[PDB]
Design an enzyme around this catalytic site. Structure first.
Site, short mmCIF file in Angstrom:
data_model
loop_
_atom_site.label_atom_id
_atom_site.label_comp_id
_atom_site.label_asym_id
_atom_site.label_seq_id
_atom_site.Cartn_x
_atom_site.Cartn_y
_atom_site.Cartn_z
N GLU A 1 11.47 64.17 -98.36
CA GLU A 1 12.10 64.06 -97.15
C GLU A 1 12.81 62.56 -97.05
O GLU A 1 13.83 62.49 -96.62
CB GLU A 1 11.20 64.12 -95.96
CG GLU A 1 10.76 65.85 -95.61
CD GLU A 1 11.90 66.49 -94.93
OE1 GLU A 1 12.90 66.09 -94.93
OE2 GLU A 1 11.75 67.82 -95.07
N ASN B 1 22.13 65.37 -88.46
CA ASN B 1 22.33 66.67 -88.57
C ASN B 1 23.79 67.21 -88.02
O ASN B 1 24.16 66.64 -86.96
CB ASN B 1 21.34 67.57 -88.03
CG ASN B 1 19.79 67.08 -88.61
OD1 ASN B 1 19.03 66.56 -88.03
ND2 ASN B 1 19.88 67.45 -90.17
N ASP C 1 23.97 69.27 -85.99
CA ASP C 1 24.04 69.86 -84.57
C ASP C 1 23.99 68.62 -83.49
O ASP C 1 23.93 68.82 -82.38
CB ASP C 1 22.69 70.93 -84.44
CG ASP C 1 21.44 70.26 -84.63
OD1 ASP C 1 21.22 69.01 -84.92
OD2 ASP C 1 20.30 70.75 -84.35
N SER D 1 21.62 66.38 -83.70
CA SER D 1 20.25 65.69 -83.87
C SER D 1 20.11 64.72 -85.07
O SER D 1 21.07 64.86 -85.91
CB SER D 1 19.27 66.59 -83.99
OG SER D 1 19.16 67.32 -85.14
N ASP E 1 17.14 63.13 -88.04
CA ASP E 1 15.85 63.07 -88.64
C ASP E 1 15.27 61.70 -88.73
O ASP E 1 16.25 60.84 -89.30
CB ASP E 1 15.90 63.87 -89.74
CG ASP E 1 16.18 65.29 -89.79
OD1 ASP E 1 16.02 65.94 -88.78
OD2 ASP E 1 17.00 65.92 -90.83
N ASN F 1 12.73 65.35 -86.51
CA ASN F 1 13.94 65.67 -85.73
C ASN F 1 13.96 65.50 -84.20
O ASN F 1 13.06 65.88 -83.51
CB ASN F 1 14.51 67.26 -86.13
CG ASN F 1 15.65 67.49 -85.57
OD1 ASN F 1 15.88 67.99 -84.50
ND2 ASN F 1 16.70 67.08 -86.28
N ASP G 1 2.68 74.04 -84.85
CA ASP G 1 3.64 74.92 -83.75
C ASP G 1 3.76 76.31 -84.32
O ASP G 1 4.48 76.97 -83.67
CB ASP G 1 4.80 74.32 -84.07
CG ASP G 1 5.89 74.59 -82.92
OD1 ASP G 1 5.60 74.54 -81.77
OD2 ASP G 1 6.83 75.06 -83.24
#
Ligand SMILES: [Br-]
Ligand SMILES: [Br-]
Ligand SMILES: [Br-]
Ligand SMILES: [Br-]
Ligand SMILES: [Br-]
Ligand SMILES: [Br-]
Ligand SMILES: [Br-]
Ligand SMILES: [Br-]
Ligand SMILES: [Br-]
Ligand SMILES: [Br-]
Ligand SMILES: [Br-]
Ligand SMILES: [Br-]
Ligand SMILES: [Br-]
Ligand SMILES: [Br-]
Ligand code: NA
Ligand SMILES: [Pt+2]
Length: 129
Positions: free
Chosen positions: A35, A46, A48, A50, A52, A59, A101
């Site tokens: 990562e 990203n 979209d 967003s 990280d 995110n 989650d």
């Protein structure tokens, strides 16, 4: 901060990640390697909109507030900047929420594609733990 491999393993253990939700320390170290290359200051935008953040590339769409991700939530109740600190507490705390989650460590695409099913113990080999 750019952690050494065994340095990060020791910090992750201290903060309770070894075997958290059943994921051995080597999984967490491997995830961080791919990562962020162990760099707390890593960021990645990203498509979209967003971003990280940090050693585990958490995110902004769900997990932290950066003020620029429309429609997003902040489930870890932190500014995303907290995830860039030399102190990994905020990243670890938030990671514990993420991995609980429902999809486990599959939430980290790099873990699924590069760590899952591999000899993850290699990532902690040699370390004083
Ligand atoms: Br450094
Ligand atoms: Br390494
Ligand atoms: Br090392
Ligand atoms: Br430590
Ligand atoms: Br702690
Ligand atoms: Br391991
Ligand atoms: Br926002
Ligand atoms: Br919003
Ligand atoms: Br929220
Ligand atoms: Br905030
Ligand atoms: Br730390
Ligand atoms: Br923690
Ligand atoms: Br925190
Ligand atoms: Br799981
Ligand atoms: Na957010
Ligand atoms: Pt901790």
């Amino acid at each position: 901060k750019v952690f050494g491999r065994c340095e990060l393993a020791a910090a992750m253990k201290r903060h309770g990640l070894d075997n958290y939700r059943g994921y051995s320390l080597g999984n967490w170290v491997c995830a961080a390697k791919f990562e962020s290359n162990f760099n707390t200051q890593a960021t990645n935008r990203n498509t979209d909109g967003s971003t990280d953040y940090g050693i585990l590339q958490i995110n902004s769409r769900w997990w932290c507030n950066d003020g620029r991700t429309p429609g997003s939530r902040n489930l870890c109740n932190i500014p995303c900047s907290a995830l860039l600190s030399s102190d990994i507490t905020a990243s670890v705390n938030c990671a514990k929420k993420i991995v609980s989650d429902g999809n486990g460590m599959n939430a980290w695409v790099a873990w699924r594609n590069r760590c899952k099913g591999t000899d993850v113990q290699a990532w902690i080999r040699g370390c004083r733990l």
